[PDB]
Design a protein around this nucleic acid. Structure first.
Ligand SMILES: [Mg+2]
Ligand SMILES: [Zn+2]
Ligand SMILES: [Zn+2]
Lengths: 98, 79, 1321
DNA sequence: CCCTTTTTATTCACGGCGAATACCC
DNA sequence: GGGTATTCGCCGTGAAAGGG
RNA sequence: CGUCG
RNA sequence: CGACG
């Protein structure tokens, strides 16, 4: 089973999983630890921000691959925004400082 | 080649050579630069890593080349 | 964008300003229309509609009308992205309390107010009242009154008695209580310090009040007044088709909360009595309990079909939460998964990829190539050309899968070699071809295993996969300096069959001119493969600098070795080829080729070795059969004599001569001896079974059996499996702990019955359950071990330290286990090494120990080298490049910016699955050495000991130490100081049942205060047992003159107190001497690794001496036992107790010393750190972990344990505060104290005294400066409650904090980018 | 879309932390 | 007048559905 | 790691 | 959310 581009979930902006549904493979925490054992800065930056999150960034990355540019953008992960809206639903305030 | 060993002997950090090779291969693809070595059905990463090993492309060499290009751009915009 | 995350409490005005409207209707779905309702959880005027730029009525269809409001209900035009950020709020007519500030363990409200938790539960559940605004009242302000006390409490006091019930009373108690005067009175109460538990509780309350004062939050915000909701896009409700409707549980909980709030609002408008509004407030309290976090109480609600609903906190914590399944681990694109295949025609830097997977995973690259080549009109034409299976885009794939590496990955990942990079080729099939040389690092056999493949997109990701994650660059192990590319079973068998010695073959006794003639004679068939011939070889050496010399010689070798010499390059001599070439010989050859030539000729040499082995494995033709597993003809005789001996000892047991407890040991001993004899006969029959004649008489050589060739070369299978296969397998033990006395007689070649197959299945099921549980235990252990040292990056190159550890090979009592070369390899020493012979300087201070200084270190025969470690560093927030040393992956030093803690945790957690879940004499010759013992001469000419911490060493004739022993107190010595001993001679002899009471002086003994009936009992045997209550006896001695014998130097007289439960055989009035005792008194494995790393307290710990001084008995076990250790010039406010189970080892008339063991058993890891030192607990835990690892046979370097040890003691406490702002009872970081005292000790101010304390892998990971890495490790609610109360400000510094926010981790390029960002800022 | 009454009562290993009774000077 | 050793519980990880 | 509802 | 390898 292989997937380049497919559908995504509605509760979070992540690809699906399995063979009957068009989904990709799961990059677990041990793979993140094995990448952190190497340098893998831009490898980990493109693994969990460009391929899964950044719904406006992955389209720009696809257009850059189509036009012939191997350059990406950091963007903003949508799962962190979901977590920020989830903790704010309780009686705990959390925001980002500049 | 098949391995990256002599680039460690040239630059003994193995982190800045990747960045300067990406900076060399990016300007040869987006902007467009003349390759200093003859290519034989190779991509820009292998061309940049081959230009690293000979010594024509380095960190300070690329910095002074960018500075000379910016000085030529300001001299062209001045006239 | 942002650089810090600030967390605080939620003000109700902030929740009112966050939302845009108020909800009133509880209904969400009307089940008739597709549009949502105008008010509810799925609102349209608050959160927005679903369609982009379209209202509910259908009047706005143009984008130019954006900027107005709707007149029907108030639904403005929105997008699909802005609907996820709009929220709503719910007002509360009745106040309620929070759950995270109620059961935080300890409670925040219970710590802020002077009230236990049960009274707070009684007030919050409407069980009892609290008096508010008493004023001039004899009753206490926090007094609890029952239901019958309210009547006379209202009708007794003359003033107005107003007492609130519920959360309003708690809110009034919070509003009426101030903060500055309360903390002022608490600081005025600090000077009492009556009890130490009240002292630490009071300082904890002062720290909580100060954390409330310095923060910008209020204590009144714990009472919930305005409650925010989640957006409807975060809670998707897909309309299913069936008899029942599918919905989320959180929406049902919110609907129940809105229903209870609307019922309370309808109840307040009818002037209801107190009990019904009390029950309504209780139902609203249960509703807000079920909404926020359910399951913490005794009654967890169940929605449908007996299933507890997931609240807002249940979907965050745990394994299936958002931190572990949506932030650290995400689904990725451009990925595949197939079945692995061998594919022996590939190289090391390449793998095999199918055409369908390469066409699917590279669709946008093919599209971009078709756009740049000018072949397709648009992207849709290229898509139609791709999905129609044309023969036009096939040669375009040869240009994009040429120099583009992919990331191969196995589903279990233990270390960094589980993810490697290969250049994929296009093969035909549906499977991935994984190279056999990397299978030892992947630990993947081809019995249906699956692997994942990833495709990098960024140019920097491709360059990092090529330059760092390549398979040709990672050939060494991360735990030790050994090559991971080794021939496993087939290549080593081919190289063993090709290079072997024979006594007679075809073409023996002929001389050849070169290796090409030998290969031609082997391919032509005129000469055999294994024959002793003579060839002319030219070997190249590199003894000169700049050139390689050559030498021509003729050596007697084999034809197969002459063929293999063409594989061997010029950098290696002929001594590595002419050997037996087993399993370790090829690894030593590859290590020599890597250490002499380098990385470039080694990756071709290993591939050529694998190609030659795979080529000669087909030419060998090794097969197994019945005649290969031979049977010894003398086995049945040994079995017959063994059965006769068991029958004779059974007859002797049944006659009544030998008891069964020794007969069982005799039976199992003679069966083990018979098994060893059968195994020795089988090995002698296997290794010598073929005889080949040369001229006349015959000769005996090593046999050419296939199973013996597979067992001797180390190809596949150890010697124990061959012993269980050919010979008898031995005794099979019971799983409960015992072992059956009868073994398995028949082997696997012969037939078996059902009795010889039951205990083997018992042991196999026990081993299978053991490994199935211990692999999950090891996974949990390495998951705990990664998060301890996940934020240690090398930021400096040289710092300069004067302290260090004393690196020395440890001696357990027998021979050596770890030599000097494998302990100090690649580590910078601390100071100069002192020479015992001439006393000069060998090494400088800051120098690296390469492979040449270790030869001088072992030739000088040094004892201990002061080497800098990871714990004794001084770099702030990380270590330097000199305190670590070699990274065990490259020949040079470690570069700056490498996260070595994750590599250390991965190298520790990887072989954790292999872990299972009377007299002192010498052995060799040499001199002895006594330490910490005073020698007292005896009357017979021997020497007696008096100290308890004595230790004996063995010094050789050169000056080194090769043997050490530990003798307890009360043992005579046989050899003297400076006397050479021999092998097989006893030194110390003692009894482990009787403790000595023998003094060092002589004299006529005399009993004192021994009355029969009160303290002694006389009851053949002429002795009395020692058990007027508080009157202790004494043992005085009389000399020949008649006066008192006083010991010069010590003020204690010559008397001894008799201990309890001890017999005294000798009476008084006789001359005594030294040597006669007067009074005669009678888990390793992975849980051990978890106990050592978790720093848990033992079951029965030992008590260590705090200060040196004489001892004094306070009590004699009436209810307790108290001992006093008083010094000479000081007092002692320390009184310890005895748990009435530990044997008292310390006496009153012996030498005292701080640091002595008084109880047999394991010692606590906290007492050795605070009393002995800081470099003593570290070496002890490193040696214990290394002993547990060497019990199995794995090899892990000492730095990986030392970095975890350094991360363990990172926290510290303050003893004396002084002029600093920190208190004397708080636990802060050591780095903050180190950067705060540097400006205080250099100036005229005073500093604070600190003392390091040891923490486990769980307590030190959860207690840190950040609140994100501590919330995703084990728990979430407690650290979020602490971060909300204290108001911590997080800074993205470590590695785990950048994975959550999604940016660059501090790698080497990450350290470069972080230094550039710090330079720009 | 809303009240009520007769009883659904369902089983780990190991460790950290908080709280009600006590003997002795 | 007053306090910590011992013990015992709670928590951390791997009572509400039926008809009109 | 997958399959099913 | 449960069963199976
Ligand atoms: Mg397998
Ligand atoms: Zn409208
Ligand atoms: Zn240092």
């Amino acid at each position: 089973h292989a997937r380049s581009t497919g559908s995504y979930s509605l509760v979070t902006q992540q690809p699906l999983g399995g063979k009957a549904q068009f989904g990709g493979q799961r990059f677990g925490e041990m793979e993140v630890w094995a990448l952190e054992a190497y340098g893998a800065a831009y490898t980990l930056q493109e693994m969990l921000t460009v391929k899964s999150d950044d719904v406006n960034g992955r389209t720009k990355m696809y257009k850059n691959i189509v036009d012939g540019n191997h350059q990406m953008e950091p963007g903003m992960p949508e799962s962190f925004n979901v977590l920020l809206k989830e903790i704010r639903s309780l009686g705990i305030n959390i925001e980002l400082e500049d | 080649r098949v391995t990256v060993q002599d680039a460690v002997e040239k630059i003994g950090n193995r982190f800045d050579l990747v960045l300067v090779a990406a900076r060399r291969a990016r300007q040869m693809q987006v902007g467009g630069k003349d390759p200093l070595v003859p290519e034989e059905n190779d991509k820009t990463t292998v061309i940049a890593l081959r230009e690293i090993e000979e010594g024509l492309i380095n960190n300070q060499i690329l910095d002074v080349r960018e500075r000379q290009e910016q000085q030529e751009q300001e001299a062209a915009e001045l006239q | 964008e942002f650089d810090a995350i600030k967390i605080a409490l939620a003000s109700p005005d902030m929740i009112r300003s966050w939302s845009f409207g108020e909800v009133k209707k509880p209904e969400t779905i009307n089940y008739r229309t597709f549009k949502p309702e105008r008010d509810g959880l799925f609102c349209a005027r608050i959160f927005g509609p679903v369609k982009d730029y379209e209202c509910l009525c259908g009047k706005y269809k143009r984008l130019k009308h954006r900027g107005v409001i709707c007149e029907k209900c108030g639904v403005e035009v929105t997008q699909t992205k802005v609907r996820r950020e709009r929220m709503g709020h719910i007002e509360l007519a009745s106040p309620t309390a929070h759950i995270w500030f109620l059961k935080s363990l300890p409670s925040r409200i219970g710590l802020l107010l002077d009230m236990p938790l049960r009274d707070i539960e009684r007030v919050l559940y409407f069980e009892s009242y609290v008096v508010i605004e008493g004023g001039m009242t004899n009753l206490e302000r926090q007094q609890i009154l029952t239901e019958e006390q309210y009547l006379d409490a209202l009708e007794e006091f003359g003033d107005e008695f107003d007492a609130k019930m519920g959360a309003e009373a708690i809110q009034a108690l919070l509003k009426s209580m101030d903060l500055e005067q309360e903390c002022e009175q608490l600081r005025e109460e600090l000077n009492e310090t009556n009890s130490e538990t009240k002292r630490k509780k009071l300082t904890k309350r002062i720290k909580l009040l100060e954390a409330f004062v310095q923060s910008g939050n209020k204590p009144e915000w714990m009472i919930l007044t305005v409650l925010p909701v989640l957006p409807p896009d975060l809670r998707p409700l897909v309309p299913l088709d069936g008899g029942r409707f599918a919905t989320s549980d959180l929406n049902d909980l919110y609907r129940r909360v809105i229903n209870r709030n609307n019922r309370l609002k309808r109840l307040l408008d009818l002037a209801a009595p107190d009990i019904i509004v009390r029950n309504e407030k209780r139902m609203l309290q249960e509703a807000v309990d079920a909404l926020l976090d359910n399951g913490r109480r005794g009654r967890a609600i169940t929605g449908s079909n007996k299933r507890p609903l997931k609240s807002l906190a249940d979907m965050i914590k745990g394994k299936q939460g958002r931190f572990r399944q949506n932030l650290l681990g995400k689904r990725v694109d451009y990925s595949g998964r197939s079945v692995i295949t061998v594919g022996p025609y590939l190289r090391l830097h390449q793998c095999g990829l199918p055409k369908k997977m390469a066409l699917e995973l590279f669709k946008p690259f093919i599209y971009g190539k078709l756009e740049l080549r000018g072949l397709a009109t648009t992207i849709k034409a290229a898509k139609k050309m791709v999905e129609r299976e044309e023969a036009v885009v096939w040669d375009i794939l040869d240009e994009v899968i040429r120099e583009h590496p992919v990331l191969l990955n196995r589903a279990p990942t233990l270390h960094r070699l589980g993810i490697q990079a290969f250049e994929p080729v296009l093969i035909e099939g549906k499977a991935i071809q994984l190279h056999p040389l990397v299978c030892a690092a992947y630990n993947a056999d081809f019995d249906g295993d699956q692997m994942a493949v990833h495709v990098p997109l960024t140019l920097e990701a491709q360059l990092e996969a090529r330059a760092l994650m390549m398979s040709t660059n990672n050939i060494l192990s991360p735990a030790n300096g050994e090559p991971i590319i080794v021939p496993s079973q087939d290549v080593v068998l081919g190289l063993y069959y090709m290079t072997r010695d024979c006594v007679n073959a075809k073409g023996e006794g002929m001389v050849l001119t070169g290796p090409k003639e030998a290969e031609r004679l082997y391919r032509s068939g005129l000469a055999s493969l294994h024959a002793r011939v003579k060839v002319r070889i030219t070997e190249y050496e590199k003894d000169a600098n700049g050139e390689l010399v050559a030498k021509t010689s003729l050596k007697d070798t084999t034809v197969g070795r002459a063929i293999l010499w063409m594989i061997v390059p010029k950098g290696l001599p002929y001594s590595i080829v002419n050997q037996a070439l087993g399993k370790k010989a090829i690894s030593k050859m590859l290590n020599t080729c890597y250490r002499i030539l380098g990385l470039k000729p080694t990756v071709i040499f290993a591939d050529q070795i694998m190609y030659t082995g795979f080529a000669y494995a087909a030419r060998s033709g090794a097969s197994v059969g019945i005649d290969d597993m031979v049977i010894p003809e003398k086995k049945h005789e040994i079995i017959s004599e063994a059965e006769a001996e068991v029958a004779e000892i059974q007859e002797q047991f049944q006659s009544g001569l030998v008891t069964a407890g020794e007969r069982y040991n005799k039976v199992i001993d003679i069966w083990a001896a018979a098994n060893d004899r059968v195994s020795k006969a089988m090995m002698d029959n296997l290794q010598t079974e073929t005889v080949i004649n040369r001229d006349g008489q015959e000769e005996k050589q090593v046999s050419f059996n296939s199973i013996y060739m597979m067992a001797d070369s180390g190809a596949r299978g150890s010697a124990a499996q061959i012993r269980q296969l050919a010979g008898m397998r031995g005794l099979m033990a019971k799983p409960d702990g015992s072992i059956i006395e009868t073994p398995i007689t028949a082997n696997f070649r012969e037939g078996l019955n059902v009795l010889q197959y039951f205990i083997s299945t018992h042991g196999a099921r026990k081993g299978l359950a053991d490994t199935a549980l211990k692999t999950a235990n090891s996974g949990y252990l390495t998951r705990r071990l990664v998060d301890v040292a996940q934020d240690l990056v090398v930021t400096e190159d040289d710092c300069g330290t004067h302290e260090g550890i004393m690196m020395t090979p440890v001696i357990e009592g027998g021979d050596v286990k770890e030599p000097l070369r494998d302990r100090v390899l690649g580590r910078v020493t601390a100071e100069d090494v002192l020479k015992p012979g001439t006393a000069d300087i060998l090494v400088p201070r800051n120098t690296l120990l390469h492979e040449q200084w270790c030869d001088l270190l072992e030739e000088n025969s040094v004892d201990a080298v002061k080497v800098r470690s990871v714990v004794s560093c001084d770099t702030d927030f990380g270590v330097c490049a000199h305190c670590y040393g070699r990274d065990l992956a490259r020949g040079h030093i470690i570069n700056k910016g490498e996260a070595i803690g994750v590599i250390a945790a991965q190298s520790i957690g990887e072989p954790g699955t292999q872990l299972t879940m009377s007299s002192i004499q010498v052995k060799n010759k040499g001199s002895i050495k006594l330490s910490n013992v005073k020698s007292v001469v005896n009357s017979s000419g021997k020497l007696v000991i008096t100290s308890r911490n004595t230790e004996l060493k063995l010094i050789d004739e050169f000056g080194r130490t090769k043997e050490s022993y530990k003798v307890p107190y009360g043992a005579v010595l046989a050899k003297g100081d400076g006397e050479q001993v021999a092998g097989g001679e006893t030194v110390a002899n003692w009894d482990p049942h009787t403790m000595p009471v023998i003094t060092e002086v002589s004299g006529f003994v005399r009993f004192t205060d021994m009355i029969d009936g009160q303290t002694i009992t006389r009851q053949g045997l002429s002795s009395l047992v020692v058990l007027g209550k508080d009157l202790r006896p004494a043992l005085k001695i009389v000399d020949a003159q008649g006066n008192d014998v006083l010991i010069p130097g010590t003020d204690m007289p010559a008397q001894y107190f008799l201990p309890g439960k001890a017999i005294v055989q000798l009476e008084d009035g006789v001359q005594i001497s030294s040597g006669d005792t007067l009074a005669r008194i009678p888990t390793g494995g992975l849980p051990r690794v978890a106990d050592l790393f978790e720093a848990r307290r033992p079951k029965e710990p030992a008590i260590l001496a705090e200060i040196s001084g004489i001892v004094s008995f306070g009590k004699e076990t009436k209810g307790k036992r108290r001992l006093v250790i008083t010094p000479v010039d000081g007092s002692d406010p320390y009184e310890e107790m005895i748990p009435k189970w530990r044997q008292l080892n310390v006496f009153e008339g012996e030498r005292v010393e701080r640091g002595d063991v008084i109880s047999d058993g394991p010692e606590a890891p906290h007492d050795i750190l605070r009393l002995r030192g800081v470099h003593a607990v570290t070496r002890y835990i490193v040696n214990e972990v290394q002993d547990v690892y060497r019990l199995q046979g794995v090899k892990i370097n000492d730095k990986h344990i030392e970095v975890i040890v350094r991360q363990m003691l990172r926290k510290a406490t303050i003893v004396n505060a002084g002029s600093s702002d920190f208190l004397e009872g708080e636990q802060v970081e050591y780095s903050r104290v180190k950067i705060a005292n540097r400006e205080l000790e250099a100036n005229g101010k005073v500093g604070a005294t600190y003392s390091r304390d040891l923490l486990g892998i769980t307590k030190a990971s959860l207690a840190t400066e950040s609140f994100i890495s501590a919330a995703s490790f084990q728990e979430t609610t407690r650290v979020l409650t602490e971060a909300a109360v204290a108001g911590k400000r997080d800074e993205l510094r470590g590695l785990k904090e950048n994975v959550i926010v999604g940016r660059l981790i501090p790698a080497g390029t990450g350290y470069a980018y972080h230094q550039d960002r710090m330079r720009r800022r």
